[PDB]
C-alpha cells in the first residue's frame, strides 16, 4: 500500500529536506573509505512516502511511548541509509533492518549527520561500494537515503568515541 | 533485536572524541520509525 509522491524543487518541503541533507554533511574519520569523498550532494529527487497502515503502526507506538514519558514522544527527524531502503518503504522497519553488530547493540540505527547514514547505503562499512563499479566513492551511481520520523521517548545517553 | 535499556525507549550515542560529529540513535522496535522521505542523490566530487 505504499505510494511515492514526488516533491517539486520549488516546494518549501523539498527545500527544507534538501537543506537538512546538505547542511549535516561532515568529514569522517575513515577519510571517506566507507561513504566516499565529498562535501555535498547532487539531490536528484525527494519523494514523500505514503502508507496508511505503516503510518498508523507508527502513531500507535508513538502514543504508547508518549504516555510512558509525560506526554512526550521525543520525536526527531533522522537519516537512515541501508541496502534495504526499498523494502523499508513498502513493509516498514522491523528486526531485518537492525544492525546486529552496532556499538549500542542489535537495533535500528539513525544519524543526525546525513553523511554518517551515507556510509551504510551499500552495506556495513560501505560493503563493496556501488553494484555497477564496486566503488564506495562512486560519483555516477544513484544512491538513496531515508529521512525518517523517529520516536525516541526516554533515551539512554551513552557517551562514546 | 536487543531490548532498550530498562525504563528507556531508545539509546543516544553522544560523540565524546570528535567535536564535529552529531549524535546517532538506536531504536529496538521497528514501529518507532516511519520512513517519511525517500531521497535520491549522488555524492559530488570535490572541486
Ligand atoms: C540492516 N543492516 C545491515 C545489517 O543488518 C544495516 C542497516 C543500516 C545500518 C545503519 N547503521 C547506522 C549506524 C550509525 C548511524 C547511521 C546508520 C545508518 O543510517 N544505517 C546498519 C546496518
Ligand atoms: Zn557506480
Author numbering:
A (entry chain A): 952 to 1112
B (entry chain C): 1115 to 1161
Passage from the reporting paper:
Two homologous tankyrases, TNKS1/ARTD5/PARP5a and TNKS2/ARTD6/PARP5b, catalyze a post-translational modification, poly-ADP-ribosylation, of target proteins. Tankyrases are enzymes (EC 2.4.2.30), which belong to a family of proteins known as human Diphtheria toxin-like ADP-ribosyltransferases. Tankyrases control β-catenin phosphorylation through regulation of the stability of destruction complex by ADP-ribosylating Axin and therefore inhibition of tankyrases offers an attractive strategy for treating cancers with increased Wnt-signaling. Tankyrase inhibitors interact with the NAD+ binding groove of the catalytic domain and they bind either to the nicotinamide subsite, the adenosine subsite or span across both sites.
In particular, increasing the size of the para-substituent improved the potency in compounds 29, 30, and 31, all characterized by an additional ring, as well as in compounds 32, 33, and 34, having a branched side chain. This increase in potency is caused by the hydrophobic interactions between the para-substituent and the side chain of Phe1035, Tyr1050 and Ile1075. The most potent compounds were those characterized by a substitution in the para-position of the C-ring. Structural analyses revealed that the para-substituent improves the potency through hydrophobic interactions with Pro1034 and Phe1035 residues in the binding pocket of TNKS2.
